[PDB]
Each structure stands twice: as C-alpha cells, then as structure tokens.
Amino acid sequence: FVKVVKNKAYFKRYQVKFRRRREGKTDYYARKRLVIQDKNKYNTPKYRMIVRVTNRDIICQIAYARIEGDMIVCAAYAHELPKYGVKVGLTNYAAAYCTGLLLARRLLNRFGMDKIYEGQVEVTGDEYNVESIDGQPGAFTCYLDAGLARTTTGNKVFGALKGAVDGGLSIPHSTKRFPGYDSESKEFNAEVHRKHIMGQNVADYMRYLMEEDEDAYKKQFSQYIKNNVTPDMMEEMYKKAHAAIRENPVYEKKPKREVKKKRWNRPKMSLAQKKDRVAQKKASFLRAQERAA
Amino acid sequence: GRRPARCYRYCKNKPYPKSRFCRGVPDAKIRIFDLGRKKAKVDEFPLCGHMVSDEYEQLSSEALEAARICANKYMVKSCGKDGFHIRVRLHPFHVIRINKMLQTGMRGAFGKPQGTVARVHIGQVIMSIRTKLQNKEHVVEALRRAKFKFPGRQKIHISKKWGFTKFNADEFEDMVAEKRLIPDGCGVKYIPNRGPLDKWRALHS
Amino acid sequence: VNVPKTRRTFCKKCGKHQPHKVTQYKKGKDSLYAQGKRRYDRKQSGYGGQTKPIFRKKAKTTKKIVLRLECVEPNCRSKRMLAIKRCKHFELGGDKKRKGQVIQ
Amino acid sequence: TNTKGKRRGTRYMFSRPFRKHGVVPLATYMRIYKKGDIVDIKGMGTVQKGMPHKCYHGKTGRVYNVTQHAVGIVVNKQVKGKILAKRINVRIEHIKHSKSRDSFLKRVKENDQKKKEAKEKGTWVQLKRQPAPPREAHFVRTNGKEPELLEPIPYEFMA
RNA sequence: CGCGGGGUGGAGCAGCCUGGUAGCUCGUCGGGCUCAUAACCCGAAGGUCGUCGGUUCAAAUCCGGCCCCCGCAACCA
RNA sequence: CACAUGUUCC
RNA sequence: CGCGGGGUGGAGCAGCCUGGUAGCUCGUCGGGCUCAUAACCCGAAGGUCGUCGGUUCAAAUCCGGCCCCCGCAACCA
RNA sequence: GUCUACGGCCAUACCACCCUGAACGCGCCCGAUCUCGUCUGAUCUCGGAAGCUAAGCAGGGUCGGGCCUGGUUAGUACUUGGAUGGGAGACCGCCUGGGAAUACCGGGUGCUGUAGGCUU
RNA sequence: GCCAGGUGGGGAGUUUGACUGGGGCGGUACACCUGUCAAACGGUAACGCAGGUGUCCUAAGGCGAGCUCAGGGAGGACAGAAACCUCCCGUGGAGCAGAAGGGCAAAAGCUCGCUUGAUCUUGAUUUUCAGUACGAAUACAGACCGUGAAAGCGGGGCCUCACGAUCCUUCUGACCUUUUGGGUUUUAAGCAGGAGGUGUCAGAAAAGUUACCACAGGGAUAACUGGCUUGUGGCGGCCAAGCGUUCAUAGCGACGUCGCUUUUUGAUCCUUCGAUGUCGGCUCUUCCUAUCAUUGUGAAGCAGAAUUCACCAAGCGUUG
RNA sequence: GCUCUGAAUGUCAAAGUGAAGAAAUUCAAUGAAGCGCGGGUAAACGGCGGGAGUAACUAUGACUCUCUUAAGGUAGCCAA
RNA sequence: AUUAGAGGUCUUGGGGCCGAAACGAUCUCAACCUAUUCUCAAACUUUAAAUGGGUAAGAAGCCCGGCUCGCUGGUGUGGAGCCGGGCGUGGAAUGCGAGUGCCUAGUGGGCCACUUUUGGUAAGCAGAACUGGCGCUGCGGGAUGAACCGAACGCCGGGU
C-alpha cells in the first residue's frame, strides 16, 4: 500500500486560505494594492470601479474600502438596459459601454455634478480624459478593478471603462487595451473602436450568417429575431440608448412587497434529534439481528 | 576501560542526545528492551511488577543491560522460559562526555562522547514484568535481585493495572464484556463512543 | 560578473536619462609633479633612507570595479565614474546567457 | 561573544503564529493613525521592509510623523541606566492601536457625564477609582444542610 | 592521542591540483614461431578509483563520516 | 645488428 | 608598474616580415619493405594561428584592449 | 427566508461522502465572424441562449475526521519570596503567593457590512 | 675630482604582533553572520557547542503577466527502477546563488515580455554605540526614468553577513576659485564625488639567536613541597552468572554497582620569584598498618608436612 | 656559491643625440657594469631512495618487476 | 530519535513447498500500510506558566466656535497649524520638595554566597545571570575565622 496523505496529522496542520480565496473570487495580491489608502490621507476614500462581467449580465459598481467591508456608493447592472432600449445582447461589448456610461451619469447625478463634466456626448472612441474645472467641484476619480479577468486587448471590462470616462469619470488608463490597438504596429485607430462601441462587430456577424446559412443564423441569434433587431437598426439603437441614459440616469428601486414569509430551506437538526437517531439506528440494528437469529 | 559510575550519576547537564550535532556516539550496550514471551495476549499475564526509581539520577546503559540479564536469568529458572514478559521502560538517550588525557590541561576541554545513559526521575518506572498472578513472589525476587545492579535506591511495586495496560485490574474484565476493550496482541485497544456508527456495528456483530 | 557595454542612465550634464557608453576605468600614470610627489622626492633626497612607510601586508584579493560612463549625445561629451561591488572576474557585454538549453 | 546581527535571536519573535502564515489581513492596512496616537509595536516576519529592531518588539510609543506606508514613533528605550526617547520609522504591518489608553478615555466620559449629571441634582457622586475595599459584614445562611466534614485522604503509593 | 600524507585491474604507479570522458609499465590468458621452453609476434581478458554519505547538468577529482597505512612534532625547567 | 637453455632409464 | 618576446594542427616550431601563401616534425590511420619491434618511403585525417575591436580589395601579418608565460627593471595610500 | 456583486473576521467557514434545491440569480452549456490567445476556441478572449441542475454553488445529514469552546487531568507539574527546615548527598517537605499541558469526557459546526435582486 | 648604476651583514641603525587555564608549538575565540548557550523584554562570558564569510549575479536586479512545487498513485509502442505523454492526490513535505534561522502558493517559486530605481541629490532615523565613526539598513522629500490597462511598484539581491580613516595618488565634474605688482597661456594648487588599503579589519613600514648574557619588575605567571580535587594509580566492599569433578560464597568471582586512600600520576594556580638550596645514596630517630616473620586464635577442597583465608596485634625483626 | 665566454642580446642609470611644443616638459633612438643565457668546478658549501615478487622442508633472497631522483651511501666501520 | 507486538494486502521481494507453469493455492519470511504501544530532544514543537518588560491612570485634559494652507481632494473633503470661549470633585493607593548647569578626583587586577547556569570526574577549578555582601566595616554570636547568622558605629547612664 501507500501512506495516506490526508490523515489526522494533515488536518491538524492545515491552514485554510481566505474565504474569498478558497472560493476563487478575490486576488488579495492585487486587492492590497488597490483598496488601501496612503497613511497620510486619513479616511480620504480611495474609490475604485468594479467591473464583473458574468454569463448573462455585466455588473459595474463603485466602492471604497472600509474596515467592516467595502461600501458601494452606486451600481449599474446590465439587466437595466431594456429600460433604455437595449433589448437583447446584454453582455456584449456595446452593452458594456452602456453599463459604464449609466454608472457614470448615475454617480454624477447623485453628486450634483451632472451639469458639469458632460464627457463625450458624440462618441468617437479616441483617447479622451476629463480634467477638472477650476472654480468648480473637482472631477470624480476612481480606478478600475478588473478583478481576475485576463486583461488583454479588447476585454469587455475596458468597454465599461470607456463608457465611464465618456460619462465623466476621471479614470487613469491607456488606450492600449481598447479594441483597436494594433499590436504589431503599436498604434490606435479610434474608428474600429467606435465600431465595437456601437455594436457593429456583431452586426456584420448577423450579416455574415445571412448568405452563408440562415438556419445556423437562427441558432446563433434567436432573441435578436424575436425582438426584431436587424443589423440595420443596431447602430441607431445604441445611440438612442446612450441619449436615453444621459437624460435620466436616476435609478428607482423596485417596490418591495411583503412576502408570505415561508421557508424553502431545510432547518438544521437539533441535538435531541441527532442523539435520538443513533438510539434508533442501534436498536433497529439489533432488532433486525435477532430476526436473523 | 570506562570511568566509575560515580563520575556520571547526577543529572548535571542538559540532555545531550545523539543527533546531527553530536555524531560519533558509540552504540549503547543495551539493545533488547523486551524479552520473555513477549508474543503473549493480555489475558494470561494479569500481574505486573514495577521497579520504581526514588532518585533523580542517571542510570548507565551498562547497568540497564546488566539488570535486564539478572532479572531475565532468575525468571527463567523460576517461571520457566515463557511464563513472564520483561519490559525495560528506560531508553538511554543522554550522551555523556569524557575529556581524556593523552599536556594541555583544561584548554579546549570539551569532551568526546563516551557512552550513553538514561535520565530517570523520582517515581518513574525503570523496569516492568508481567506474569501470571500465581507467580507473585517470583517477580518481587527478580526485581530485588536487579536493584543491586543500579545506583541509588528503588522501590518494588506491584501495579494495580492489568498487565502492561493502563486499566485497573478491578475494571479490566468487565470492560471487555461490554466491549470497551478489544484485545490487541500484547495490549488492548480502548474503544470510545465517538467514531462513526458503522464501526459499532462491526463489533456488535 | 557581466555588464552590457551600453547603459541608458541619468546624465548630470544633460539633466535626464540618456544612453551612455560603458567602459572600465584604470589608473592613470602617476604625475611626476604632483605636490605629494614633489614633497616626497625632496624628502627622499640625501641620506636617511626610506622616509615614508611602504605597505606590505596585502590582504585584499580584488578591486572594486569602476565603470567610465560616457554620454554619447553629439554635443555633451561628459564622463563620470560608477562603482560596483567587488568581483574577481569581470567582462563587458559577452555571451548574454540563455535560460534553458542543452549544455556540453 | 555573541554576534551583533540585526535579527539575532529573533527565531520565535518574528515568526508567524501557528496556522497564521500567508497573506496579511487587509484590515491592518486600512487603519488610520493620527499624531499622538498611542501605538504598540510588534514585528511581523511576513513583511521584511520597515521592521523595527528587536529591542522594540513589545514596546509602546506614540506616533509623531505619518508617511505613505509607515509612521514615526517615539519609544522609550532603556540604555544602561538612562532612558532614551528615540524615534523609529516602522511600516504599518508591525503596528497596533494600543488599548491601554482607551479605558482611561472611556472613564473620562462617565466622569464628564456624571459631573454635568447629578450637578443640578446636587448629589455628590464619587469619581475617583478606589482600590478593592475590605468586603463588608454579611450573614451566611446554612438553611437545612450542615457543613460537610473534610479530612485528609490517606496516602497510597501511586507508581 | 592531537597534525599531515596516502588507498586507482595480479604488481608498482599516473590522472586529483582546476569537474565531465580511467591510463602507464609489468604480469596473466589465448594463438603463432621452436623438436621443446624462454625471448619475440599477433590478439584478448582483468579495476570500476578504500568504504559510507553529500554538493553538481555531470565527481577517481569538490565535501563529510568510517577503516587502514606512513611521516613529522611532542620543547624551557 | 641480436640469437639463451635441454628432459637423456634404454 | 615599465620594457622585451612569446601563445598556431594532439605536441613543438615555421610562416608575422617588405599583407593575398596555414608548412614541417613527432604522434594518429593505410600501403610498401624486413625474419620481426624498429628502421625505411608514400598516402589519408588532425590550426577560431590566445581572445576582442578597427583598418585594408586582401592580416594568423598593421593597430588597440584584454589574458597567460618568461627575463630584466622598478615600488610613499 | 434566500441569492448575486464587492467585502471584514479568516476552518464554528476545512475535508470526505450522502440527500434536497420553488423563483430570481450564479453556472454548466452553444458557437469562432470580429477582439484576443493557444500544439488544440480545453484554458484565455469574444458572439450567443437550444438544453440541464448532472456538476459547481447553497442548504441539510454523518454515535464522521479536523477545528472552536468547556470539563477532567489538578491545586497536580512548575514557580515568587522565606527559614540556624530535613537529608552524607541526590533531592524532599513546609511557610507565603501565583498556577499549567496531553490522554479521557462534553457542547458547537460560520457570524457579518454595503449595494442590488427573488420569494412579486 | 664630481655625479650615475651595480655589488656591499665588512660596518651601522632598528624591528622581530596580541590573545592564551605559565610561555612555546597549534589554533583565531583579532573584523563579521545564523542557531544555541541565555535563566519566556533587551543585554549577558569561556581556547563553550554546530556552522558560515573576504564571494556570486545583465539577472540571480525592476516591473507585469501566466502558471505551481517535492513526492506519490494509476495508465500509455519500443520504455526497464528510472526517457516522454495523460489523469488524480498533493499546506509546501519543493524552490528562492551560499551557512543557519525566519518568511513566501493566482508568490518572494517557475516560465515569458519589456527594461536599467544597481541612476542623480539634500537632510532625518535605526543598528553597533560613548549613544562617535565606518558598514549595513529603514522612512521620506526633490529630480529623471522603468514597468503595468491601472492602482501602484522599483533608487539592487525576501530578511538577518559579504567590508575600510587621515596623508598620498588617480579619474570625473564647473563658461568654477587661487597661481600673488598687472594681463594672456601652459602648469600647479583648491572645492565636490568615485577608485588605488590598511584581514592585527578605529587602519606602525619590520627576521632570527643567546647555555656569554644584562636591566626593570612579576608569586597577576611556570619548574618543588603544602592545600583543594581523585580522573588515573593503589586498596576494599555489595549482588552472585559462573569457576572450583560434584557444590554460588574453602578459595575465587563476570556483567554491574558503592566506597576508601593521598607512598602514583594528572587537574588547578591559593602561598613563596628584595631566593624556602632543586636527584639519589650515606647517616640517624620516630611514626603508620593496608601484617612478611614472631605470640595468641578462628577457617580450609586442613591426614601429617607444607601452604592458603581471616581475627586481636606494629612489641621485636625485615640482611650480605 | 665561485669562475669563465659574449655585441649573437633581453633588460638598465646618469650624460649625450634627435624629434614635438611658446617653453617647463614630453616622446624616441642609443645605452656600461650587473643580472638573464651558456660552460667549468665538490681536498666549494653540501647531498648520497621507495614498494612488491622470487631457490630441492622452512627461512633467506643471488635474481626479476615497478615508481623514482643531481647521485641514490661505494670502500670501510658500529648499539662506537 | 526510538521499543514492542497486532490487523492488512502480494503493494513487492527473499528459500521454497503440489505446481512445466500460473497474484491459483500453500505455509511462509521480510519490508509496506492501517490502528495501537514503550522512551526522549540546549541547537524540536501544537500548547504553556510563575517571576518579568512596555504603556496608560487628565488642565500639556476634554468640549464647542472661527480663521490659515502652495498639503490632500467628488464635497469649507481630509489633516495640520492657528486664534477665541467654556469647563477644577486636581479624577487609583502609598511615600516624598524638585529641577538644572558647570568643574572634577579616584577607579578601570576584584572576590564570596542563596537561586539559575556553561566547560570539567572533580576542585578552596574556570566562566556567566540576578540580588546581597566582603573589599571600604567595627560590634554580638558561630571556640578559632575577610564573606555565615544578628546588627551596622558620635561620647555616656538606665531599660529591653
């Protein structure tokens, strides 16, 4: 045989990692460099933009770290976009730009800074950075918390970044991870970036599946056909969406209805029950043994 | 040969075991710590006699080897060759040093390893013997003959435990009836009420 | 220790980082008219023998290497010293070693 | 004679506690330190930058200067029959807020509370702490039971 | 004892210093020449580098233990 | 140019 | 530390010079010769010419730095 | 009640196995035109929504291991101060105060902040 | 005659470390580092214990990214204990130049990409500490940069060691100061930062011998007694496996263990170095008993004889 | 150690020669003796090996092998 | 580092045994694994004292109001510095007048003891830690005595 590794001794010496690390959600190496503030700042919050793209949604939050836990000043989710006209495709790059733009304008509107710091209303895709206006409240500033996402060129977390800076957030960044930075020649053409922002890269893919195979097209886009969003009206849909966001970024929570107060989960068994089951298991094991005897 | 045992009797230094730092130590003279019918179960040797120390001193590995033989020899004549089981419960781990001469005197006088010795405490069992309770007066004479090979004074005590186990002879037999104790070769395994219930099934059937 | 023959570091005269040409520094010849040499040869003259100590108990087996940096900008033309820790062997920009390949 | 190495004899002092190795909990970093804060020093081996010298591990001082990552502390060090209030720059990880001063700060509140209170009531309420006084005279009831007897048990050889 | 040197086919020795890969002379064995042996001629076998453990991409070589051998010192009264 | 030796009862 | 001259096939040496040519000897391999080791004669293999940089149509050759070796000469932290 | 995003404490949260998961969600999953990256669209990046809770995840279970917290061990071991105390010594007792750790035996099995859902 | 080079113990002058269970020989405890000693702050000695250093590195420095190690299990043509491929387990059992300790798992490890923060410059502070330097280090600040999407991180090596004054020399730096009555130009001297080294490592330039010897001192220090100690030497117990044909103990007695003695040698260095005459023999007195003989007795494997063991016992002998 | 030979010559001082420079100065060529090189010399100072095998029983080793040095202690003599 | 038996499986191997042979069996003997078991560590450790080391126990403190900043910034934000005002039951016990500056001699051979402790067989030996002694110091006691126990000293009477 072979010696057992996971024995009594193994667990006596085992030191678990942090809960968020055992679950695989937080990189505490990068978090230590992100959240903590210089000691000569004294409770000056260090805001950071949290972008987490999931399978069916895009979550953009802005938080600053406190001792008891991060505090979210405002958040914008992708599942709100149907209000502003973006019916389907709530996780593509063009949707990420909207969620970032929504988060920006929603934050500024809670600071009375929406009139100032408009940003880029006419989206171009170039290297834009808002600078503070003298005599006015300083422009808001945060940093991007990519999390565990591999940050290569064209990652959707940078789409929300572009949406935020065009909304009026002073986020330090470089125009190198945007979709449009040609790697072998080291330049950036804002035009192709403007394509991904207005969702043109997927529009042609619907057009590509037009003459190639329509049945496979119906299989790759079903709710696009269900919501009647053809590649024709996609670019204007986002422009209508952006304008609808900048004019009403306020969020109205859903009305909270009182619920019947039931329990779907299984309550934890008590000691008396746990201790009595053993008496039944042993007794039944005997009263089944003399039946064989 | 080697110095008298008066030179190394008192626990004078910190324990100096044979290790990475103290290498080159000659082997101890005692190598066999169990003898007799050591391949015997727990139900045939109830009586257990001790040789308890009464001094915080050092017992050489040569005295341990000599006392093992003298106690072995007497039991063989008395209780036959297989009617007992001797267990020396002191292992010599402390290394003593000697600053042998051949003049230098005390310049750089850190000795070389001479031999090995066992640090015994007060009330600590030196040697134990289990046998049939019939042969009671035969072990007290075997241990009485073994004291003369040891410096200091020792008491011979007949334990209330059953054999070499840690359970009293008044409670041993029953704790085997309700199966708190399962005979495991020379000793016994205590069985609590804490394991998985499937192990309880394996015993009660 | 191996050192590349070129280093982009700070240039005092240019006031900023610039590429420098690295080369090893060596003692110049002892001038015959340095004040200490003039004073020495006047003290050594005549009778009396050796007047200053002569060091004999050599202990070090090495030197501190000194690099003679040199600004390559076509109009600055400045140099400066740059010391490094001791080493027995020393070479300028040779065989920039590779990571992982058969040895023989 | 011994060496004069900086981390000499700190085999256990700078070691991490059992099953407490690994990354540093971030709450230590997000902890503010004003000037004049009483602070106790405890070197942590996980972070080798800015460690205090071993003669300050366990000492308590007060902050006088705050930089980006570290603080300046004024600690009293006894040096052969004279005390020296000397300044050290230690990085945050080796630092805790001292809870020795707070119990005084807490006691100041009730003193300032029970002064403005019971002033208009006139009742003179004791403020100073007083040592544990000799306990009062009381009655011990033996209702029913009578005190059970204690007698030394007889000796019996253990070994 | 403390210090130093040494241990490599059957024999005597290099190689170690400074890392890769075992050689020299002789002997042994086989076949030839001779009536026969020796000499001579051709051909072959034989050590795994005292031993044990390390460092190293790699150790006869660098490092430590053990065993054996040899040399030098072991003075002032 | 070198090149030694010998088993022998009949 | 200065001067000088050496570093080349496995080994020694030439060629360096007044620049386009890398040869010899021994050793290694094959043939011939002899009774045979040898001896004798030829053939085959065996050199980044210490390394690096510059110059030149062309350097192992001129020039510079480095390294090693030898001889002589020097020696204030 | 419960989940998601970001957390604080960092096993009462881990590990093994088993059971059950409404709704939302998280996932698995479907693809490679574009972005991006691989020996390989497995990972990574990107575009999706046919299928599924099988797995992850959540909850519960185990006379579970571990961990946490007690009891016991035990006023024991050790120890501050004290004696013209004992003992040939080794060591020991007392006075004055302080006071542990296994084995063995119980109980416990994540709390929680901000923001947003679902059970309308 | 005057310079120059060689030779020159013929002659002169001087030197010929320190620590140290006396000195020498040997070591380096002489400058440093890790663990222990060390008595749970820190500090703490010995020629105490186990070791290490006079380096190495253009990356083994600096970022960022992605990965996960040692070992084991199960498999897969050649293929085996071991080549390579795959899956699973794997809290570090690996690796991080070196000694050791500490530290480290989406890293501080491994693999790539780009790089030169191993740069320029003020002070402050820590360590050793006199609270002086050097060395090393920690926090900043001003620049110039690197890297990364960014927060940031980086002014050498994950941390604890890897190093050096004045004087002199050398190099670098400025539209720099002086070079003397003024000016110009070489030269020289300054100012600032590196380097050439002192390892006896707060830093002289250094071989012996003296039995032909000298001086100042030292019992701080050896060679003798005496003292403490008793390893060693000597002497004696205890246990009893055995020996003794048989039979443990007539006489012995292993393996062990407890002591005594100071007629052996050591260990130590207390006394004596403004001197205690240092080997033996000769001579002569006295004392000790651990008794060879003699007196009186006990025991024998005591028939006698002879000889062994023991007791009281040092009276008297112990020679040529 | 001593001695002998030498332009066949590597090194070397002062002086002198030449060149460069406003000059101090710098560079070069030349450069004796002595060392280096090459001989001689021990009634000059001095020195003058190691390991295995081998003969009619044993023993021993005339003989052989090997490693080695400038030579490997010869004639003699000896517990002086 | 280390003693001993148990229960496992060919996980392998050692002589085999009926097997030509066969993890098929056979007794095995070993290592190997799983539960136990004896004995330890100055250079091991999960735990973990006693004694001990810091700091705090107010007026230089708390609490309001206002200005300054080139620092820090969603935000008269953060911090610091300034003014002005209000609060005295002096915020544990006990004891005690403190602070501060010049100039400065001698010393820089130490020794002893309780406890802790290193080398050594040990030493009236060598080396440390803590406190107190001796040295610098008499006196009562230990017959005697540098150091132990009591107690420290102007010159006397009485008492204890």
- Kindly report the backbone phi and psi dihedral angles of residue B171, in degrees, each rounded to the nearest multiple of 5, phi listed first: -115, 0
- Find, among A119, A128, A174, A122, the residue nearest to A151 by Cα: A174
Residue C76 labelled as part of a binding site: yes
Q: Is B52 on the interface with D (CB under 8 A)?
A: yes
CA of B6 to C1' of I263 (A): 25
Query: Could A282 and B200 be called an inter-chain contact, meaning their C-beta atoms sit closer than 8 Å?
Result: yes
- D74, D87 in Cβ contact below 8 A? yes
CA of B24 to C1' of E49 (A): 27
Residue type at position A286: L
DSSP C41: H
- Kindly report the backbone phi and psi dihedral angles of residue D111, in degrees, each rounded to the nearest multiple of 5, phi listed first: -65, -45
Identify any residues that bridge with D107 across adjacent strands, giving them in sequence order: none
Residue C39 parent element (H or E) = helix C35-44
Residue of D nearest to A64 (CA): D30
For residue D135, give every residue at least 6 positions away whose Cβ sits within 8 Å of its Cβ, in sequence order, or none: none
Helices (H), chain D: 102-116
Reduced to 3 states (helix: H, G, I; strand: E, B; else coil), residue A42 is coil
Residue type at position A162: K
DSSP A246: H
Gap between the Cα atoms of B88 and B66, Å rounded:
12
Query: Could B155 and D157 be called an inter-chain contact, meaning their C-beta atoms sit closer than 8 Å?
Result: yes
Give Cα separations from C47 to A80, C32, C43, C52 (angstroms).
105, 21, 10, 14
Gap between the Cα atoms of B173 and B153, Å rounded:
35
- Find, among B62, B29, B45, B53, the residue nearest to B127 by Cα: B53
Asked if strand I comes closer than 7 Å to A82 Cβ, the answer is no
- Find, among B54, B117, B116, B64, the residue nearest to B89 by Cα: B64
Burial string for B86-119 (b: 16+ CB within 10 Å, else e) reads bbbbbebbbbbbeeeeeeeeeeeeeeebbbbbbb
Reduced to 3 states (helix: H, G, I; strand: E, B; else coil), residue A34 is helix
- Kindly report the backbone phi and psi dihedral angles of residue A29, in degrees, each rounded to the nearest multiple of 5, phi listed first: -65, -50
Residue type at position B152: G
- A236, A123 in Cβ contact below 8 A? no
The C-alpha of A93 sits at a distance from chain D's nearest C-alpha, in angstroms, of 33
Q: Is B123 on the interface with D (CB under 8 A)?
A: yes
Residue nearest to nucleotide I20 (CA to C1'): B107
Interface of A with D in 39-68 (CB under 8 A): 39-40, 42-43, 65-67
- A243, A206 in Cβ contact below 8 A? no
Gap between the Cα atoms of B160 and B163, Å rounded:
9
In what order do the strands lie in the sheet containing A48-53?
A: A71-77, A58-64, A48-53, A143-145
Cα-based torsion angle of the residue sequence C68, C73, C77, C83 in order, rounded to the nearest 10 degrees: -20
- B52, B124 in Cβ contact below 8 A? yes
Chain A residues near residue D24 by CB distance under 8 angstroms: 32
CB-based touch A/B (3+ pairs, under 8 A): yes
Identify any residues that bridge with B47 across adjacent strands, giving them in sequence order: B131
Asked if strand I comes closer than 7 Å to D66 Cβ, the answer is no
- Find, among A116, A117, A118, A86, the residue nearest to A99 by Cα: A86
Q: Is B124 on the interface with D (CB under 8 A)?
A: yes
What ranges make up the beta strands (E) of chain C?
2-3, 6-11, 16-21, 63-70, 79-87, 91-92
Residue type at position B121: H
Residue C87 labelled as part of a binding site: no
Residue A71 Rama label (left phi>0; alpha psi -120 to 50; beta): beta
Residue type at position D72: G
Q: Which nucleotides of H are covered by protein (CB under 7 A)?
A: 1-2, 4-11, 13-15, 20-23, 25-31, 33-37, 44-50, 57-67, 89-92, 104-120
CB-based touch B/C (3+ pairs, under 8 A): no
Query: Could D32 and A39 be called an inter-chain contact, meaning their C-beta atoms sit closer than 8 Å?
Result: yes
Query: Could A66 and D71 be called an inter-chain contact, meaning their C-beta atoms sit closer than 8 Å?
Result: no
CA C95 to chain centre: 22
Residue of D nearest to B156 (CA): D159
The DSSP code sequence of A205-237 is HHHHHHHH-HHHHHHH-SHHHHTT--TTSHHHH
Helices (H), chain A: 8-13, 19-22, 28-34, 93-109, 156-165, 190-197, 200-212, 214-220, 223-226, 234-247, 271-287, 289-292
Chain A residues near residue B200 by CB distance under 8 angstroms: 282
The DSSP code sequence of chain B is ----TTSS-B--S---BSSSSS--PPPPS----EEES-S--SSS--EEEEEEE-S-BEEEHHHHHHHHHHHHHHHHHHHTTTSEEEEE-----EEEEE------TTTT--PEEEEEEEE--TT-EEEEEEE-TTSHHHHHHHHHHHHTTSSS-EEEEE-SBSTTSSSBTTTHHHHHHTTSEEEETTEEEE--S-S-HHHHHHH--
Gap between the Cα atoms of B158 and C5, Å rounded:
87
Chain A residues near residue D69 by CB distance under 8 angstroms: 38-39
